[PDB]
Design a protein around this ligand. Sequence first.
Ligand code: CLA
Ligand code: CLA
Ligand code: CLA
Ligand code: CLA
Ligand code: CLA
Ligand SMILES: CC1=C(/C=C/C(C)=C/C=C/C(C)=C/C=C/C=C(C)/C=C/C=C(C)/C=C/C2=C(C)CCCC2(C)C)C(C)(C)CCC1
Ligand SMILES: CC1=C(C/C=C(\C)CCC[C@H](C)CCC[C@H](C)CCCC(C)C)C(=O)c2ccccc2C1=O
Ligand SMILES: CC1=C(C/C=C(\C)CCC[C@H](C)CCC[C@H](C)CCCC(C)C)C(=O)c2ccccc2C1=O
Ligand code: SF4
Lengths: 742, 42, 30, 141, 11, 90, 144, 80, 73
Amino acid sequence: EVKILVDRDPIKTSFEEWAKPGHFSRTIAKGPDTTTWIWNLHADAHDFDSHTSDLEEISRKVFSAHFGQLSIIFLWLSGMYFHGARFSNYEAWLSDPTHIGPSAQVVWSIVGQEILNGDVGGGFRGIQITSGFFQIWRASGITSELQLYCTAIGGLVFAALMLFAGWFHYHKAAPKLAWFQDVESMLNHHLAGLLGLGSLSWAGHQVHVSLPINQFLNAGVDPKEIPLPHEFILNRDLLAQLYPSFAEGATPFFTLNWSKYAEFLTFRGGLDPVTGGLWLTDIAHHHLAIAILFLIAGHMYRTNWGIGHGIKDILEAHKGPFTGQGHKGLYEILTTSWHAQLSINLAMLGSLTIVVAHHMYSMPPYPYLATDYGTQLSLFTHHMWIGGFLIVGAAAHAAIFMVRDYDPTTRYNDLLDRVLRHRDAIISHLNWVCIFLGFHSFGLYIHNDTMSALGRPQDMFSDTAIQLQPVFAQWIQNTHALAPGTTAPGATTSTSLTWGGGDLVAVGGKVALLPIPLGTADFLVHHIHAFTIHVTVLILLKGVLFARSSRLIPDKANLGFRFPCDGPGRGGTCQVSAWDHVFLGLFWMYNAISVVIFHFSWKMQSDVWGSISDQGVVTHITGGNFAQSSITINGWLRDFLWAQASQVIQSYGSSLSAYGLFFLGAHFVWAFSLMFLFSGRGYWQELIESIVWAHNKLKVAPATQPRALSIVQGRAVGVTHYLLGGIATTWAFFLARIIAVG
Amino acid sequence: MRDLKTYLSVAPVISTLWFAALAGLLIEINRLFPDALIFPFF
Amino acid sequence: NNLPSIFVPLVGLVFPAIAMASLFLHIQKN
Amino acid sequence: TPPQLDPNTPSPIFAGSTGGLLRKAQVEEFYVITWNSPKEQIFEMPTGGAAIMREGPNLLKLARKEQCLALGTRLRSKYKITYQFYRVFPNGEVQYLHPKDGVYPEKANPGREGVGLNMRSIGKNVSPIEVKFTGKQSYDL
Amino acid sequence: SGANFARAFTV
Amino acid sequence: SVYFDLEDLGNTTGQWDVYGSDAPSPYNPLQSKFFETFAAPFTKRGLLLKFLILGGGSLLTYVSATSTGEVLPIKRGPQEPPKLGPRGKL
Amino acid sequence: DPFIGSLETPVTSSPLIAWYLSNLPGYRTAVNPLLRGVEVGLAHGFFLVGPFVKAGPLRNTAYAGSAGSLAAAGLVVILSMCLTIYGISSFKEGEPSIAPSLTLTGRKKQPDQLQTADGWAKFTGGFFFGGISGVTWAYFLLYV
Amino acid sequence: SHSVKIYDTCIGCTQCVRACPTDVLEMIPWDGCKAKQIASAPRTEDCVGCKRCESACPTDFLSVRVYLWHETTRSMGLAY
Amino acid sequence: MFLISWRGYWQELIETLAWAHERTPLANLIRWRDKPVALSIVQARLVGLAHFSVGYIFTYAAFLIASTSGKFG
Ligand code: CLA
Ligand code: CLA
Ligand code: CLA
Ligand code: CLA
Ligand code: CLA
Ligand SMILES: CC1=C(/C=C/C(C)=C/C=C/C(C)=C/C=C/C=C(C)/C=C/C=C(C)/C=C/C2=C(C)CCCC2(C)C)C(C)(C)CCC1
Ligand SMILES: CC1=C(C/C=C(\C)CCC[C@H](C)CCC[C@H](C)CCCC(C)C)C(=O)c2ccccc2C1=O
Ligand SMILES: CC1=C(C/C=C(\C)CCC[C@H](C)CCC[C@H](C)CCCC(C)C)C(=O)c2ccccc2C1=O
Ligand code: SF4
């Protein structure tokens, strides 16, 4: 049954292996004859599946790598906390948050870079930060620096503990294979233990520490006069004065009359007027409910006892109209190969990150976060980029599994075979829908441009000539506006202010949130989003499905997952491996994410953000020209790229010069990438031949003969440089513009 | 101890120590002599 | 005069149509 | 060796797929591969998916020679089974294709003629100027 | 806040 | 379970008309006679091609030339007074 | 036959779908192509008249109907020219038809006469006549 | 159809015959080397130009050479 | 397009499209005379270079003429 199984000292810690490189693979271990050897030593460093074949060693290596990664993350967190404690102006920002810019980095005075120490405010000079850490610390209840120092020390200690644990589990006591394959216990502990207890404990902290300190802060008291958090725990009088319910203690909870706790566990919803964030009582209530739900749901699978459920029984016994026998051999597939689990987890994490970004810009969960425009922009863009990258990687790992871990003899699955047997219909229909969507979505813009250039503004697809309104979205907005009165009797207001109707919420003369209207431009942009998403899905799905074999190459599995081509014959067979399909899909993911972030930035700068006056009128940043100027490509090039780049390029001689320097550097790297993307290997090898002759003429030729990069390495270098250049350009442009004008 | 020295003699580690020392020397020279566009010693 | 109103449609549409038809027929002809 | 025939051989168990024959099969040609299996076992089709081969003689139809050869070499490597495939035209002519001498090409056998042998090193070929204004090519000589 | 900034310029 | 034979290759390679129907003509005989009588001149291929090309060219040219200025903005001509160039050019 | 590059699915082979598809003018065999071409042209012209008269450059003036009908007639003429060119380039004069000669049952049937020079010529003539008639009938119905 | 030519530098290691995916090459007895055999390419019309044979050939320069030429249905690898 | 992406992916796409066209009703009465294949390698390189040159030339010509004509000085 379920038990702990370990092996004692599988490997011995010794420096002998460090002396010689490439010990994992024999062909690497032989010795270097050409430079290519070096480039291989890094390519197969983490290819644990190809070093050996036993599952036990792979699992142990995976565990140790996870521990190392956790240690690195803890070290990074400790460094951030120590920087916040030592070189920062947190205490100044605490008293006057609206007129002080956060900053936690100070530049030395070595060469002339001291001009980077801009005057953020509050008697401090330093680089303004846009990580949103200050809002997190304020919402946590931290009001000093000693607490931050203690947190940093604890983080360092935790990093050391994680490193020791990784070493101990790889070199002293290594879990056996049967320990890993016990997924029922893993799921039970991950649901009930990690997600339930953690959120319950955080709810306890929020109820006991964050709520009273934040109440005192919002009441207008000076930060240096607020009582320390432990005084609230020790003294019941202070809590009773702040909340009378605590005077009754824990008696009501055991008596099931929970309404007595309605003082600090509410259901109002909406945004708090003082700070423009969600009510902390609602957040604590939500955390408590989530804890209860997760603790309940973590006791579903049978482990070592009579009660519970079996995953294999659930999968096998499920009979449906469309599936049939269906899920039969999926349990072995998902418990035998690591790559399938990696693919599913990567897809789920990417989707979760994107949803996180959307929900976080929609409803600000931290105090004084909505009015900080740079923080919002940075958080949204960063999280969406991360989600896109993870979603892309999922397909690559699925292709790896399909290539090297799929055999129909020992493990057979009906649904997978049924999907494989009719791939042509899937690909054909996906291709047709992609063509149709792209044709319509881009033809609308081209038609708008052409009718504009000919002096025919009455034949456009616009808000005045021919209208295409998103009626369904408007209906949903109206239903959500009307919901709190009838559909949600408990909720006092709307879940978020984004839905049409309601009132503007502004903090300190700056607009925090107001309803976002939808028109023709939103229709067109959403259809463009759908088109790009569909094309990326088509590329990745084709790469995954046609990995094992194709009509052109009937034996593509033998060649492997990473092979440049098959030869000049058959008319040319370049880029048929699934790796090349991933390399092609990266560009389209980049395109889609760039378009989406551009849309979000322009819409927010045009129709939401701005300034409010004493009289009551609202003046937006760009004057609300998105509704009429974004229906043509000329409008996107002139009113958005040309107009908003003034702050980036005219930042020389000021405290934002680094942004312009990075703006130029990203352009240089993007132009550099085309050198690898466009050319071929033979020319470079033939040039290196003459260079090597010139070297040998002077008796300075090396023993490791130079060799041009392989084809796959060239493509990888090209795509890496391209992505880095584009992302850095967008980063510099966004940050400079939103810091200057926001 | 033999293999520790052998590992510390590998190319990346020796390269990073050498470049760090050179960067420190250049930084200290630039701090001691703030800025200079010509060679005024001779 | 009005020569463009007569000549532009001929060069724009009729002549390219005739050229395309003739060229396709000659290409596919065995 | 005398070429054999494939009169009435049955076929493996399959559920159907979209990677089968096309108009070229009705118009130009197709290929037929025959082998003999000692037990009913599951194998993987070149077109896509998995099928089951019966005991006794088995026959299959394919669209290109590469698919036939790939399936045959998989059978030889994994199941240790001899195989042979022919080419079929719309007119009904059947042409024997795989081992013509009854022996796989990797092993030498007397009675085989030499085709396309140049009795010189690859660097003794003449320059293209020598063969200009004539139909022949330098490597052809 | 002044001391935090001065920590960089101690030398 | 035999799917190959050499006597007749029609069913071997799949030469079927899936949706072919061989029912008699359901059209009214009078309608068919009228349509056959009135569609005779267009049966020939080369004559139809020449007629189509020549008639289309002639009709398009005539419509383009005869059309007045109300339908076509380019046939209306300019109305506003001319304006000078940047540096005083005409 | 599993090894043919096709699948049997509820949509591909259903009694209702097969009955509907076997009655369309383009799928009859014993009928001379002229009548089927006439029917196809009538349907296509009547369908085509609409969008030109509704979304053209002169949709807001009093010249919408005439301009749209003329545009539809031009499209019909161009389609007829394309059909004639394809028929000339594809099928030869004296050669027999290339239609399948047996059905799913395997019972032999007369090959379709559409896949021949004379048959395709009759089909194109019928399509041209039907398209012109449908265009003018739609124009008469819409604006009278 | 492409053109595959075998030169006399061959040593008869049987690698090119195994590497071919279309059964183009074969081996015949010979007397110009130690292994007493050489390669030959009878079924040239089936060659698809994949150049797999040239990849597995140990020699200072390859003893088997493939020159691309007029293309056709078989050499292009069309399944339709 | 032509300067980055290469042949095999497009050849597979054409394979699938050919199957789709052959398997559809009311559209299989029309048959192609030339089998559709993807472009060769040298042809794709030439096409990409031609597109690059045309775009370069047209963009610079437009910018130069418009910018010099706007001010006439
Ligand atoms: C991509 C989509 C797109 C669309 C929808 C439009 C739409 C429009 N254009 Mg623009 N245009 C585009 C791209 C597009 N354009 C591009 C790329 C250019 C080049 C720069 C132009 C340049 C342009 C010019 C120069 C002009 C227009 C004008 C117009 C109008 C004329 C349309 C017309 O008469 O033909 C419509 C013809 C049809 C035959 C419709 C066919 C489609 C049918 C409805 C299919 C439905 C299929 C069916 C339901 C499917 C299932 C079948 C089942 C039932 C069995 C129309 C509003 C004209 C104008 O001024 O209008 C105001 C005009 O002069 N356009
Ligand atoms: C090279 C020369 C050229 C010329 C001279 C024209 C000329 C014209 N274009 Mg075309 N066009 C061209 C190239 C050209 N085009 C190209 C390259 C494209 C692709 C971008 C288009 C795409 C295009 C669109 C999208 C539209 C036009 C339309 C028009 C018409 C606008 C006039 C008017 O205001 O409508 C007055 C009203 C009319 C409807 C005229 C009706 C009479 C027509 C011309 C038919 C006459 C029938 C005749 C028998 C045709 C068959 C002959 C055959 C050989 C062509 C006019 C006939 C518009 C149009 O006509 O809509 C259908 C329009 O919407 N053009
Ligand atoms: C209720 C107890 C429990 C808890 C809390 C966890 C929690 C976790 N497990 Mg799981 N796990 C459990 C039971 C538990 N597991 C069992 C019984 C099995 C065997 C079936 C596994 C199998 C397993 C594997 C194979 C892996 C994990 C991993 C992880 C980590 C994921 C990283 C993360 O999400 O950051 C959340 C961040 C924090 C909570 C870190 C704080 C440190 C925690 C609180 C330490 C205490 C936890 C530990 C279980 C108790 C100490 C035991 C020891 C003192 C005797 C996380 C520490 C992955 C990992 O990261 O590798 C190390 C991993 O690869 N788990
Ligand atoms: C969740 C974590 C995750 C994990 C654990 C893995 C795990 C694995 N991946 Mg997957 N992958 C992921 C996410 C992940 N992947 C994502 C998000 C993508 C999409 C890009 C991919 C796409 C992918 C590909 C395309 C491939 C793999 C492969 C591999 C395996 C080999 C790893 C390797 O050798 O690298 C060793 C380390 C390196 C080569 C480091 C390269 C340097 C990076 C690319 C530079 C990033 C630049 C930096 C941020 C910029 C700073 C600039 C400054 C330094 C100047 C390994 C088992 C490889 C395979 O063959 O599997 C068997 C392979 O071919 N993965
Ligand atoms: C703008 C981007 C770009 C750049 C910079 C280059 C650069 C160069 N080209 Mg390439 N090329 C490009 C695009 C580009 N190309 C494109 C689009 C094509 C069409 C396919 C080609 C095709 C091509 C051909 C056909 C040839 C070249 C050659 C050359 C070299 C010419 C000699 C010279 O200029 O050295 C000047 C050197 C530099 C400017 C390189 C940058 C130096 C870096 C910045 C220094 C490192 C500093 C810093 C510490 C970096 C650390 C990295 C970090 C990770 C730590 C040079 C490396 C020629 C050659 O190889 O000559 C020998 C040649 O044969 N190129
Ligand atoms: C997303 C992400 C992130 C974040 C994260 C987080 C934030 C986390 C958290 C986490 C958590 C927050 C966790 C928690 C946990 C907890 C636990 C694990 C607990 C436990 C407990 C216990 C064990 C207890 C016991 C006991 C006692 C002592 C008393 C009574 C009885 C009993 C027995 C119950 C970051 C930024 C980093 C980045 C990356 C990604
Ligand atoms: C530029 C280029 C090359 C040549 C690139 C090379 C040789 C990489 C050179 C990398 C560095 C700069 C070489 C030296 C690295 C050493 C570690 C230097 C040690 C000494 C000190 C500087 C540390 C290819 O081989 C190639 C192949 C296929 C497609 C495209 C291309 C391509 O674009
Ligand atoms: C898109 C693409 C294709 C597919 C492209 C195809 C099949 C061409 C499709 C052309 C259609 C018919 C449109 C042609 C439009 C032109 C206006 C017509 C030609 C005009 C001249 C004759 C004057 C490749 O085959 C390819 C091969 C190798 C590297 C890259 C690529 C590549 O990028
Ligand atoms: S190129 Fe390929 S198919 Fe042709 S002979 Fe060589 S290995 Fe065989």
